[PDB]
Paper text:
The system includes an inner membrane platform of GspC-E-F-L-M, a periplasmic pseudopilus composed of GspG-H-I-J-K and the outer membrane secretion channel GspD, called the secretin. In this study we used cryo-electron microscopy to characterize the structure of the secretins from V. vulnificus and A. hydrophila and in addition determined the crystal structure of EpsS from V. vulnificus.
In addition, we also solved the cryo-EM structure of the EpsD secretin of V. vulnificus, which encodes both an EpsAB fusion and a GspSβ/AspS pilotin (EpsS). Analyses of top views of class averages revealed that, for both secretins, symmetry is unambiguously pentadecameric (C15 symmetry). The resolutions of the resulting symmetrized maps were estimated to be in the range of 3.4 Å for EpsD and 3.7 Å for ExeD by employing the gold standard FSC criterion. One of the clearest differences between the two types of secretins lies in the outermost region that is positioned towards the exterior of the cell. This region points towards the inside of the pore, closing the structure on the top. The Ala-Phe motif is present in EpsD, much as in its counterparts from V. cholerae and ETEC. Interestingly, as in the case of GspD, α-12 from the S-domain of EpsD was in a conformation that did not allow for EpsS binding, and our attempts to fit EpsS into this region led to clear clashes.
Residue numbers in the entry:
A (entry chain A), H (entry chain B), I (entry chain C): 600 to 649
B (entry chain O): 449 to 460, 475 to 599
C (entry chain A): 248 to 267, 283 to 375, 390 to 460, 475 to 499
D (entry chain N): 500 to 549
E (entry chain B): 248 to 267, 283 to 298
F (entry chain O): 349 to 375, 390 to 398
G (entry chain B): 349 to 375, 390 to 448
Write the structure that this text describes.
């Protein structure tokens, strides 16, 4: 799992060529379950703050 | 069962389902150690280049494993790598280092394919546990 | 740790035989319901407690290494004079000088007296079509010498490794493939398949079928 | 429960029409009045080509 | 080291004949259950 | 030709195609060749 | 003719083919003959089918020393448990 | 196994003709299991260092 | 076996006509099992030396 995740994080360093680097599927850190995309996470807290 | 897919019909006409299927008979053990009897299929009706009907591209992995409560375990896998070179050249003229490439025709191809299927059984005993699992989602 | 749906099968023989007893497995709770005499009961209980051990499980990693390497040299020179049908042709080379000289004449502009007409390169294209190398023509006063050479150096290095995890003594299939259908119409799977019935022995020595 | 959303699509290749079926048939046990999550699928894909 | 699914077959003849006995092989654990 | 099948196109098809795509003359008419 | 079937091509096909491949005249038009008959003759010549045309006696000399050679060495091993079939 | 590996390491000395020599599949040293491609391994440590 | 090997060693003396004489399959000396092609064997030791 941790090997795939390494590969995929890589492909995030050299991101989806013409897209925003954020859309490239990446496994979460092993046993952390999903983390929301940043923009949405940023939105969610803003909502929480409000 | 779980199938997110399409039922393509196929000559024999039977209607076979072809998608992400996942058919687990999860059977919880003492020590919160779930023992899954899983049939997991990702499949993906492609063309029928040669064949009579449509060729389904199927990656099914049907096994029985025994997993902890809440730790992931790796059912399956495949790490393919390929590498086909080819070079047609005008024999000896395609040897020269600088100018060889004028007479050579090289064709190189490297396909690398990593398919791991992990599975994570989570046991939902207490309702409160379900609330979380569900809510979070 | 055991499926009771399957354990009841085994206890059928311990059950009746020992008596000389109804064992029933309730799927739902993976609990099999025993209705024994008290000894037969204490007995079935000692059998179920020893069949009910956890099963270890094997990660069958197969490792298929198909490494193929091909090297061809065709070299062969064909002389030809079509004015007076004189060929030194070879079939073994891509193209035979006949097809090529005929093709070249057809690809020439004919004259039917005065009109001119541009010949079809359909015959020359059918000749040169199949030349995988170098089919060069030194045309020396009407003796066309088609020299042919190709050093096809192929190379293939496939390394596909499929692992499956399976519970000891369980069968497990794995197929990463395609189900192509084939006349007989049956739909046969055709891929990297791997179908191991791994059965772990004493001394941690797995015995795979 | 046997729950199916499905949605007759075309039959690109196939003899008849291909139904696009997302069925999810299971047995769960829910509280009175709390929601529980039967099913799921979080697909992500990302094909580059150059 | 043996598949019990197949050993029970062989012990059928040793079993009944000797008595003149139910041998059952539990696939799962590759353990055959003898009631002798 | 020094043609190769292994590459997309083989020079034969391409040179034939280029000649067919040229404007022929049948004597005086002119005609525009098919790029088919 | 002094023809032979045993050789690639028989002089008949070749001489006929050569005449058809010649430019005919139907009186005045000229016409360029099809090499479709000569191509069907020479098509099947795997060696050397040379024509010494001596005042209208066409001597087609044919020679080929086809020296083939094949050296296949395929070795498959299987591992098997004694008394198991594999 | 060790014979194949020799062959394949060879084909790495005379690498995939027009590609970067790193893509040519090579069996790992017998009983070492896989080692990540170098670039990714280089990336992973850098991440670790960070 | 030893008769075939003789033939084949022969065809190595008068080698594959336009190729490098090394590619012509030859049975190994009886009960010696395979020997690597020379180039690869040369490579392997070089690696060993390194």
């Amino acid at each position: 799992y941790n090997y795939i995740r390494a590969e995929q994080l890589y492909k995030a360093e050299q991101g989806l060529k013409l897209m925003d680097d954020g859309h490239i599927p990446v496994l979460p850190k092993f046993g952390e379950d999903k983390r929301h995309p940043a923009e949405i996470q940023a939105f969610i807290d803003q909502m929480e703050q409000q | 069962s779980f199938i997110v897919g399409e039922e393509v019909p196929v000559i024999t006409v039977d209607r076979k389902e072809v998608g992400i299927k996942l058919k687990v008979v999860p059977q919880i053990n003492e020590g919160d150690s779930v023992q899954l009897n899983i049939e997991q299929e990702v499949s993906n009706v492609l063309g029928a280049n040669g064949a009579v009907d449509v060729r389904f591209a199927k990656r099914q992995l049907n096994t029985s494993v025994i997993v902890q409560d809440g730790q992931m375990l790796v059912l399956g896998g495949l790490i393919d790598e390929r590498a086909l070179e080819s070079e047609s050249k005008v024999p000896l003229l395609g040897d020269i280092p600088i100018l060889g490439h004028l007479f050579k025709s090289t064709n190189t191809q490297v396909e690398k394919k990593n398919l791991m299927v992990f599975i994570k059984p989570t046991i939902i005993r207490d309702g409160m546990t379900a609330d979380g699992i569900t809510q979070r989602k | 740790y055991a499926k009771a749906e399957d354990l009841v099968d085994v206890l059928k023989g311990v059950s009746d035989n020992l008596q000389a007893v109804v064992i029933a497995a309730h799927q739902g709770t993976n609990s099999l319901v025993l209705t024994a005499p008290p000894d037969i009961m204490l007995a079935l209980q000692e059998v179920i407690t020893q069949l009910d051990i956890r099963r270890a499980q094997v990660l069958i990693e197969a490792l298929i290494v198909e490494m193929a390497e091909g090297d061809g040299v065709n070299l062969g020179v064909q002389w030809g004079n079509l004015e007076t049908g004189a060929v030194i042709q070879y079939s073994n080379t891509g193209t035979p000088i006949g097809k090529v000289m005929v093709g070249l004449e057809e690809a020439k502009d004919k004259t039917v007296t005065s009109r001119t007409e541009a010949g079809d390169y359909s015959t020359l294209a059918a000749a040169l079509a199949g030349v995988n190398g170098a089919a060069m023509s030194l045309v020396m006063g009407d003796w066309t010498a088609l020299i042919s050479a190709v050093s096809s150096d192929s190379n293939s290095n496939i390394l596909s490794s499929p692992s499956i995890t399976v519970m000891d003594n369980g069968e497990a299939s794995f197929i990463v493939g395609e189900e192509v259908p084939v006349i007989t119409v049956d739909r046969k799977e055709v891929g990297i398949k791997l179908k191991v019935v791994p059965q772990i022995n004493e001394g941690d020595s797995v015995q795979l079928n």
